[PDB]
Amino acid sequence: KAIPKDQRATTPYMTKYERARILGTRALQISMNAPVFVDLEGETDPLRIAMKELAEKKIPLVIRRYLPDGSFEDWSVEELIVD
Amino acid sequence: EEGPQVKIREASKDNVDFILSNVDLAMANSLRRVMIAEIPTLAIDSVEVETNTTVLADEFIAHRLGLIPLQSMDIEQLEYSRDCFCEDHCDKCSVVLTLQAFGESESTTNVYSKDLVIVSNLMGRNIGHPIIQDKEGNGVLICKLRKGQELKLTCVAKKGIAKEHAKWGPAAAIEFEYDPWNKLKHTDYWYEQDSAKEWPQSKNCEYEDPPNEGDPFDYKAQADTFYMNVESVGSIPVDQVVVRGIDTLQKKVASILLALTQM
Amino acid sequence: MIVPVRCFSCGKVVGDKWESYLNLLQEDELDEGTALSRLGLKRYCCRRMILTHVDLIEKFLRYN
Amino acid sequence: SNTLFDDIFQVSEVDPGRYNKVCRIEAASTTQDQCKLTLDINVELFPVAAQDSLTVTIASSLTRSWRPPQAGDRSLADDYDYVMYGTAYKFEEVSKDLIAVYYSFGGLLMRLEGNYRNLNNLKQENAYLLIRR
Amino acid sequence: TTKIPQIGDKFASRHGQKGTIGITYRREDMPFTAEGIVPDLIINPHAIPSRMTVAHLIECLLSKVAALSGNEGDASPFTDITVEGISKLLREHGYQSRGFEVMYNGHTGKKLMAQIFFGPTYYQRLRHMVDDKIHARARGPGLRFGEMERDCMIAHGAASFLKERLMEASDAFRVHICGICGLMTVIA
Amino acid sequence: DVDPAKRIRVSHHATTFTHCEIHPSMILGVAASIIPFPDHNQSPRNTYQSAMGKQAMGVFLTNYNVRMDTMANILYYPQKPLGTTRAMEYLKFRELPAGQNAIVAIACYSGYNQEDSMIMNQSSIDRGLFRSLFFRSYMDQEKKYG
Amino acid sequence: ALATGNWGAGVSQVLNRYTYSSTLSHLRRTNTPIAK
Amino acid sequence: MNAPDRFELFLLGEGESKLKIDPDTKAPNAVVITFEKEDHTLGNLIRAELLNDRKVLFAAYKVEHPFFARFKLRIQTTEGYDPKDALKNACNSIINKLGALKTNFETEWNLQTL
Amino acid sequence: DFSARTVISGDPNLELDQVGVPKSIAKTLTYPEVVTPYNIDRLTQLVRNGPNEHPGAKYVIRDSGDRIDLRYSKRAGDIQLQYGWKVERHIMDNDPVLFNRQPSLHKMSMMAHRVKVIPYSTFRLNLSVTSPYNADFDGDEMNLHVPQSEETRAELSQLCAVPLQIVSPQSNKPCMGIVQDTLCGIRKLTLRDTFIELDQVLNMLYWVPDWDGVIPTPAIIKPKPLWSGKQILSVAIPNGIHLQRFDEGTTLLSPKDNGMLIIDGQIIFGVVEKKTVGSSNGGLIHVVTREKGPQVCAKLFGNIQKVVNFWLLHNGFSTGIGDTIADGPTMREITETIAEAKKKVLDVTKEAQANLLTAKHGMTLRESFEDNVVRFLNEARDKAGRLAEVNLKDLNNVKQMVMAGSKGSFINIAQMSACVGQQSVEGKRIAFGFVDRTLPHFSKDDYSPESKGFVENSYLRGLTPQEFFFHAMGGREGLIDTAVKTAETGYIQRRLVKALEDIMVHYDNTTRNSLGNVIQFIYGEDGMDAAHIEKQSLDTIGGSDAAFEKRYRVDLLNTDHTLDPSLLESGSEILGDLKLQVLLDEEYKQLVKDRKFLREVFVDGEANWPLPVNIRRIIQNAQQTFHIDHTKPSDLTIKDIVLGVKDLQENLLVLRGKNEIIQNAQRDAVTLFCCLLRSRLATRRVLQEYRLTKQAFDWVLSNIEAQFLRSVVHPGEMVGVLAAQSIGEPATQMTLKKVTSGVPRLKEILNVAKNMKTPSLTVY
Amino acid sequence: YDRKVPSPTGEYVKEPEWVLETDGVNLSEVMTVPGIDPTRIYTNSFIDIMEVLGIEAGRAALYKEVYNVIASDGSYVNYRHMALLVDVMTTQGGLTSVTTVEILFEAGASAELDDCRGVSENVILGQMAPIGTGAFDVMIDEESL
Ligand SMILES: Nc1ccn(C2O[C@H](COP(=O)(O)OP(=O)(O)OP(=O)(O)O)[C@@H](O)[C@H]2O)c(=O)n1
Ligand SMILES: [Mn+2]
Numbered sequence A: 001k002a003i004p005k006d007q008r009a010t011t012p013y014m015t016k017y018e019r020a021r022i023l024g025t026r027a028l029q030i031s032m033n034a035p036v037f038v039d040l041e042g043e044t045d046p047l048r049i050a051m052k053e054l055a056e057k058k059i060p061l062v063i064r065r066y067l068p069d070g071s072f073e074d075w076s077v078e079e080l081i082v083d
Numbered sequence B: 001e002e003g004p005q006v007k008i009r010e011a012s013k014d015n016v017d018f019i020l021s022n023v024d025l026a027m028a029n030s031l032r033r034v035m036i037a038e039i040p041t042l043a044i045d046s047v048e049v050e051t052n053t054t055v056l057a058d059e060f061i062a063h064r065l066g067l068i069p070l071q072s073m074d075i076e077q078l079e080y081s082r083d084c085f086c087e088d089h090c091d092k093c094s095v096v097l098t099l100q101a102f103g104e105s106e107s108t109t110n111v112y113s114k115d116l117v118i119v120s121n122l123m124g125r126n127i128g129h130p131i132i133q134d135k136e137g138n139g140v141l142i143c144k145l146r147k148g149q150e151l152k153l154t155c156v157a158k159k160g161i162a163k164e165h166a167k168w169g170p171a172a173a174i175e176f177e178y179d180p181w182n183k184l185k186h187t188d189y190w191y192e193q194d195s196a197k198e199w200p201q202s203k204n205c206e207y208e209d210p211p212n213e214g215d216p217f218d219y220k221a222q223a224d225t226f227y228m229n230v231e232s233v234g235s236i237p238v239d240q241v242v243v244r245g246i247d248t249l250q251k252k253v254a255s256i257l258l259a260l261t262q263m
Numbered sequence C: 001m002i003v004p005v006r007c008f009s010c011g012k013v014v015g016d017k018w019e020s021y022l023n024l025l026q027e028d029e030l031d032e033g034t035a036l037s038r039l040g041l042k043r044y045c046c047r048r049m050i051l052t053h054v055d056l057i058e059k060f061l062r063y064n
Numbered sequence D: 001s002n003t004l005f006d007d008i009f010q011v012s013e014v015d016p017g018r019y020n021k022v023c024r025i026e027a028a029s030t031t032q033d034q035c036k037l038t039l040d041i042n043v044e045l046f047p048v049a050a051q052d053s054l055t056v057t058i059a060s061s062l063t064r065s066w067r068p069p070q071a072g073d074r075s076l077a078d079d080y081d082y083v084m085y086g087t088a089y090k091f092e093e094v095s096k097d098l099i100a101v102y103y104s105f106g107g108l109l110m111r112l113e114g115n116y117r118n119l120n121n122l123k124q125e126n127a128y129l130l131i132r133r
Numbered sequence E: 001t002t003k004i005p006q007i008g009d010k011f012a013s014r015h016g017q018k019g020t021i022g023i024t025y026r027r028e029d030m031p032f033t034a035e036g037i038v039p040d041l042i043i044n045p046h047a048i049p050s051r052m053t054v055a056h057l058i059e060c061l062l063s064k065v066a067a068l069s070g071n072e073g074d075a076s077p078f079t080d081i082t083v084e085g086i087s088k089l090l091r092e093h094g095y096q097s098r099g100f101e102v103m104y105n106g107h108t109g110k111k112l113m114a115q116i117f118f119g120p121t122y123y124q125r126l127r128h129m130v131d132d133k134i135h136a137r138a139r140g141p142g143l144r145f146g147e148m149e150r151d152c153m154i155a156h157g158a159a160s161f162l163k164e165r166l167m168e169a170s171d172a173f174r175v176h177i178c179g180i181c182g183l184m185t186v187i188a
Numbered sequence F: 001d002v003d004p005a006k007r008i009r010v011s012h013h014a015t016t017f018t019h020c021e022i023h024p025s026m027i028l029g030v031a032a033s034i035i036p037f038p039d040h041n042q043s044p045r046n047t048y049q050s051a052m053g054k055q056a057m058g059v060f061l062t063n064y065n066v067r068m069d070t071m072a073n074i075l076y077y078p079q080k081p082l083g084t085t086r087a088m089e090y091l092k093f094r095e096l097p098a099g100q101n102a103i104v105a106i107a108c109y110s111g112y113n114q115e116d117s118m119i120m121n122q123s124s125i126d127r128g129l130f131r132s133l134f135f136r137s138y139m140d141q142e143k144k145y146g
Numbered sequence G: 001a002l003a004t005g006n007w008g009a010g011v012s013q014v015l016n017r018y019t020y021s022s023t024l025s026h027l028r029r030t031n032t033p034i035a036k
Numbered sequence H: 001m002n003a004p005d006r007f008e009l010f011l012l013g014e015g016e017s018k019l020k021i022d023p024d025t026k027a028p029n030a031v032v033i034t035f036e037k038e039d040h041t042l043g044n045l046i047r048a049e050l051l052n053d054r055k056v057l058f059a060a061y062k063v064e065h066p067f068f069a070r071f072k073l074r075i076q077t078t079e080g081y082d083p084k085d086a087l088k089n090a091c092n093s094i095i096n097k098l099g100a101l102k103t104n105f106e107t108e109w110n111l112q113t114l
Numbered sequence I: 001d002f003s004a005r006t007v008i009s010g011d012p013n014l015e016l017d018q019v020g021v022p023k024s025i026a027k028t029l030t031y032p033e034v035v036t037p038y039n040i041d042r043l044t045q046l047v048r049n050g051p052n053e054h055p056g057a058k059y060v061i062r063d064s065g066d067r068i069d070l071r072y073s074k075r076a077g078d079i080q081l082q083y084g085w086k087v088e089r090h091i092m093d094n095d096p097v098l099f100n101r102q103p104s105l106h107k108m109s110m111m112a113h114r115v116k117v118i119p120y121s122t123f124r125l126n127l128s129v130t131s132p133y134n135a136d137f138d139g140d141e142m143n144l145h146v147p148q149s150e151e152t153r154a155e156l157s158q159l160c161a162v163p164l165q166i167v168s169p170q171s172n173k174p175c176m177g178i179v180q181d182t183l184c185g186i187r188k189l190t191l192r193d194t195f196i197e198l199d200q201v202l203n204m205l206y207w208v209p210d211w212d213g214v215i216p217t218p219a220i221i222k223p224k225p226l227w228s229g230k231q232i233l234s235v236a237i238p239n240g241i242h243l244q245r246f247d248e249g250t251t252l253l254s255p256k257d258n259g260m261l262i263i264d265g266q267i268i269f270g271v272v273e274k275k276t277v278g279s280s281n282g283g284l285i286h287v288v289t290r291e292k293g294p295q296v297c298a299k300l301f302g303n304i305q306k307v308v309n310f311w312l313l314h315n316g317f318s319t320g321i322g323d324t325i326a327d328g329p330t331m332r333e334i335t336e337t338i339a340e341a342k343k344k345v346l347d348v349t350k351e352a353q354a355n356l357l358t359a360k361h362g363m364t365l366r367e368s369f370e371d372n373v374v375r376f377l378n379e380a381r382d383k384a385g386r387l388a389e390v391n392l393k394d395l396n397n398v399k400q401m402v403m404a405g406s407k408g409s410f411i412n413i414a415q416m417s418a419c420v421g422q423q424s425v426e427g428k429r430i431a432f433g434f435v436d437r438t439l440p441h442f443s444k445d446d447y448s449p450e451s452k453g454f455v456e457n458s459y460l461r462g463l464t465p466q467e468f469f470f471h472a473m474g475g476r477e478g479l480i481d482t483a484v485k486t487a488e489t490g491y492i493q494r495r496l497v498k499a500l501e502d503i504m505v506h507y508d509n510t511t512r513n514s515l516g517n518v519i520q521f522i523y524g525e526d527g528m529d530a531a532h533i534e535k536q537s538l539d540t541i542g543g544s545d546a547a548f549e550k551r552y553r554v555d556l557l558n559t560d561h562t563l564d565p566s567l568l569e570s571g572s573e574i575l576g577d578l579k580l581q582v583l584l585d586e587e588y589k590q591l592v593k594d595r596k597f598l599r600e601v602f603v604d605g606e607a608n609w610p611l612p613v614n615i616r617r618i619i620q621n622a623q624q625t626f627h628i629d630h631t632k633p634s635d636l637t638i639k640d641i642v643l644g645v646k647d648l649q650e651n652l653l654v655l656r657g658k659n660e661i662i663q664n665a666q667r668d669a670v671t672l673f674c675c676l677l678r679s680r681l682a683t684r685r686v687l688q689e690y691r692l693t694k695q696a697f698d699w700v701l702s703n704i705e706a707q708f709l710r711s712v713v714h715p716g717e718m719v720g721v722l723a724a725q726s727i728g729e730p731a732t733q734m735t736l737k738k739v740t741s742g743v744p745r746l747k748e749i750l751n752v753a754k755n756m757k758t759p760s761l762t763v764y
Numbered sequence J: 001y002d003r004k005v006p007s008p009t010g011e012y013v014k015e016p017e018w019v020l021e022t023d024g025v026n027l028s029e030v031m032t033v034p035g036i037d038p039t040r041i042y043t044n045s046f047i048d049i050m051e052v053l054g055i056e057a058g059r060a061a062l063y064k065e066v067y068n069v070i071a072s073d074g075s076y077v078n079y080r081h082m083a084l085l086v087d088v089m090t091t092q093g094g095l096t097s098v099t100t101v102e103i104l105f106e107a108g109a110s111a112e113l114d115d116c117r118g119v120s121e122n123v124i125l126g127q128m129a130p131i132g133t134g135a136f137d138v139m140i141d142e143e144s145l
């Protein structure tokens, strides 16, 4: 049941867990010859590639946070702060 | 003859005590090491057992075989088996020895290493002979049998270096010391009540002048003299452990030169 | 089982001294440490080699 | 490029406590009622006795490798016996209306009380120290 | 089979501390005494003070005498044997008397700043060694992953791992399902 | 006038003994009779040794050659301990020992002996220190109740 | 019953022969089944 | 087993060389050679002599794990001076002083009885 | 499945996060890697090598799902890989894998490591991951697990990896630190007198893998170039690390070479031992992790080891029978010390034996007597040991170990060298098992020392028969008490972890169970992660009323109580200023109330409590970073400070809801950090203490705020398990008064036992 | 006993006090005796704490017992793990201890609803548990350039 982009109340920061899932979801795909979106400035290693992706902010996924009552907030990779 | 200086103080077939003088610790130590690890020598490194009715297992005896020191004074004229174009072994890469023994007597019959027969062509290079130094000319006890008990064996010796297995090594212990008074302070002496009461004077102190209790510590000194003493097991005479030692160094370092050249 | 051929620690051959060690004691009546020094085994490593061998073969050879 | 303090001391005291090669000299100025030295010294490379006395200068040269002697076979911005190189860690103990600046030589420590050289002593490390006998 | 000692095998003195061999060195590389004696074995001092195994250390001092003098060294319990006396005798045998010796670094020849406690000590090989013990089960046609190993991985947050390692190979079968009556009743 | 190095013992405050022990060292059992100086050890340790000695390798009997057991471990080169107890005699430990007298250094030298680990001399090994025989026997029966 | 340890059970076991004194020790053991 | 055969401590694997020489990035006039199937015996000796050479600004070696016989020696030198040149220069003295010594020895031994 | 198990060994040449895997174990385990034009060349070489040569491969699978077995496969040497095929390749250097020592009682017993392929047959580890796995090298074996996909690889390296587990939440400090050898030696290396010469020096420098190549300059130039141990360690400690510490009379000239002080990554003063380099609250490994990050920190241990074990390999360290001997005079003083206590017990004896002893209140006579002779005998034991400890020298190698931290304590010296002491079984002297006596070598009714278990002797001297037997009685008691401990302990641990396993933090910051219920309305009452929290002192709380007003009151309107103008540029110009005064008086009022509040929360007065954001450290850093002259007024103004600090408060956020409810929570959650705050960045402090500039000041604060926000707990963490493992694991290292204690207590707790063993009221 | 208490000038000082400590427990009644401080009486029986002073006071006594255990061994566990535990034991308001087919039949007749947040549930089903890295979903970002 969905929570509008304004009014969102959870962290704007990426969590460790989200980042670990992201990079690995992505590296699974780059390891299955999916197209990539960044410059390969030498890299062969799919995690690594993905982590340059996540730093240049070109990973187009969205994290859907459920709250404990069935409600959710959708935050884009692009947006989440990575500390 | 300018440079590193020698000074024998004893010598014997078996030992050679000396003093190196005007040289760095490192070269000293390196000579040390080479004597211990890298000087070629001869030793059983293959044994085929036709028969062993002995009370000892085959590997057991085989091992003991590799340990009996074998004449090695012509060992530069022996190629390493792995450099020789033979298939396996032959007379340019090996001595072959034989061992047979049957417990003929009621009482127990010893197998010693003089009971080792060479079988192969030496080309008149003095190698392979079991080395003998006991009164009785037995050399080493390999085995023992009871009446009815048999052992038959061949062995192959090969040239080898103690890095590879210590059987191949020529030297036995090698004394080595420097600064017997303590004057460099390279070591700091543990004690209860007094550092001199309690530690023994090395014999190597006479040769060297006690320090004098005013004399403020000498920051410039180096390690220039060393007291060694090489002991030979016998496969190679002694003076020879040292000269061949010197010499293996010097080839070590020249392989380095040749390979700057090939860069 | 049988004298070992060399000192474990120094390499000195020690396999050629057992006969004698034992003749030095039983025939010329030396105490174990003057004996061992007669054989030239003067570091403690080789001493221990002679001094603690146990000739088990002697008991193995009693079986037929 | 300079030198920056320099004076002559009286040594009140030489404690070696617990160490052997190292000792802490409690020295005075001949001149000033006010300016003091506490300092650590390698006694084996430079012995020092009760009441001996001392010529002491902090200086600031003659941050790149180090290179052995050779420059050192003529170029000696030393005519001393004893020279350390340390780092000021100071506490401007700024105490009473006299200074104290701190210095550590690889851990052999120093400390100068006084006042006339506030507009003198490097805020900063690069600080050598020199002694002749 | 003959079992040559290796890295991994176990050893022990008789004072109730074991070790495994961590690495072997050949003789050149060991530290040596001026007499050119070198150790068969080097054990760490940290193993000592907290175990309070002074028997070890006296066994080694009495053993050194006994080898140098050719007598059996009386280690029985409850006698008048004393360090003092043991050390006495060792000193008459020209060693310093608490069993230290100066030793030299093998790599370099140089002497060692501190001296070393050095002496024979009766060590036992115990059964039960890294060849019996090494296995590695990864199929083709302990050693597990229990509740407590799960719980560590839930503590880390590692859900993907926890699913892969706990799954079946038992294939994901697919099924349609009513969204009112959740059952597998659906004619597809 | 006592030997400052001896242990304190507190005397016979006794005129009525009726007996005397034969030897205190008889309070021990078979295993702990093999530890040297166990009166210089913390108590638990004598307890672990009394176990691990049961795992050491020596010569279990002079007959091994001829038995055939599941498993057996005989060391190449048994030596008798430089330090023994008087109880050993009776336990024959000198005759069928389980051990060898290793020259041991106690030292930090490289860091590869940390945390109840040891550096061993490969040359020493080369020349046999600690080597041992191992035997496994396998059995089988024949046909049965078919 | 010699074969099993069937009696009180572990009453009979196989003689240890690891080492001579482990044997002597085994022959000398005791066991208490089951307040300090 | 998983033990590497002993010969590997003194003899070269297919494909490997006695030296590899590599330029140091850290600092100028600096190299790191890595010597295979060599150890301290050579390593500490060449090293020690590169430091009797006054155009030698740095020298040092190490075996980075004791399982492998390989050592790595790093020479840094004054501008104008190839390091490789310094290693010949020092290999050269070594061979010289030994030269010597074998001679002072071979002599001192004849002067001898037993 | 995809795992192996061997014997582990230690190795000073591997990094913290490595694991050596024998090659034969690397050839058995496999990872499925997908052909892609990034790897199709390596994969191909691997295929050509095969099962039996490592780097190689055991299977290739195609499109179809057909499994090509390279050992058998008549075409094993002729395979042309296609894109999208898979290759099950052996594992190889740098693949992640998980390594675990059982029993796995907390999550750092299962960490992810970097493979290093090695010869012989044991898994090998760095000495400093030892402690968390509670593993050593007399036998222990460990398991290793190989992850099977890319996701799974990424989990393991981005959350379970070694380096990430340096600092643990269990106790809000490191769980890994320098041990054993490198400890013994890092101390010896760092003493006053330790100097090194250039040959050795440069060999130490080269030994640090990322030394920039610069020979640092020697602390002695003059007779000799001689560098100190200090400075060479210092090469390993990276730039931008600052640490200070004052031990019981340390000063900035530490006579003794106590404490520590370290600035810009160089040691200035103090010997480095377990406090500095061990796994200690506020020490270098905790600092560097935080200031520079996990990966650097985990390099540091391996640089430090590099260095120091180098050095220790050349220096040497042993111990011997000698180190336990104390002086003939000392042993005569020990012997009397002991004699005196036996006389005191004798008079107590006679005294009881004439009935002139009194009990005091409900305690029997005999109990009274026992309690007294056991005080006496232990006070002996102790005095005798302190005696020994004093007498032994600095060069005493046992002492050198205790000194450093690496191994041994007092009681050790004591028992070895001076006297082992009273033995006891269930809390009492050896009891009369025969009738009226402890052994038949005594007469009846004997309550003396020797009769009931004192052991007079040391281990050096050896025990008597009687002594011997009563120490083994004692001994035994431990060996049973330790199996019962270990088993009681493992069952609690597994029930607390099943109890708590489902609690998690949710993206509301709430902590809840698998039905949603709330257990905590925000995790930990503060919403932090306990890895990020450190012991700081809250300054307002302590101190006299006078001294708090010196330190914090600014009165602009008084010429004694304003800010001197050398503090501050604006300082002339604000004297007498009325309206700055009204802000400053509101700052103070707040500091005042802060002091009342806290003193109600910690009624005791304890000042030091764990909080997130180490502000001292930050200020220390801004002081280094901006080259700060203590000798010129600052350009800060009153308001930059005082509003500057107010404003920072509003952005220290843990909760983020628009309504009032969440806002009050937000404010209550940040209360205690806020008081530290205000205390630390009060006006007079900022100026007269810290001396900050404007720039430095504004750096302070945007630092405080990123650090704060990065401490907050992350949603999704399973804090339940955590909790339980943190309470459990330490409950296992209880292997060890007249209230029920330790594990059975804790059994009586978690059981909710109607019928406790010692129930007690304390009445004031 | 010594008790740190602020002094008139503000800084904390020791001030001894006598204290009584008992074998056996009657809190409701001893609380009442003249001359004691009832605000500060304690007991290591948390049960009784709960029964005289209620759930919250019980929860604070329980913490304090668990922390005592842990610190008497001389170790240190951060607050929030034992605070967790103790909240767990007191959240239903009383002190609750922490220490197949049959079962499913019960579920059936009770209409058990299993939330499917656990790990084993989720393994049965072939899925990741909504813990850690499972506690959100990830979706393809159609909203981006
Ligand atoms: N830092 C320290 C200090 C001491 N010990 C110990 O020494 C005692 C006995 O040693 P040992 O039996 O060898 O311990 P473990 O090696 O753990 O025994 P095992 O591996 O056979 O289980 C134990 O109580 C154990 O605490 C330890 O692991 N770590
Ligand atoms: Mn252990």
Ligand SMILES: [Mn+2]
Binding pocket: I135, I136, I137, I138, I139, I140
């Ligand atoms: Mn262990």
Ligand SMILES: [Zn+2]
Binding pocket: B081, B084, B085, B086, B087, B088, B089, B090, B091, B092, B093, B094
């Ligand atoms: Zn040939």
Ligand SMILES: [Zn+2]
Binding pocket: C007, C008, C009, C010, C011, C012, C043, C044, C045, C046, C047
């Ligand atoms: Zn020897």
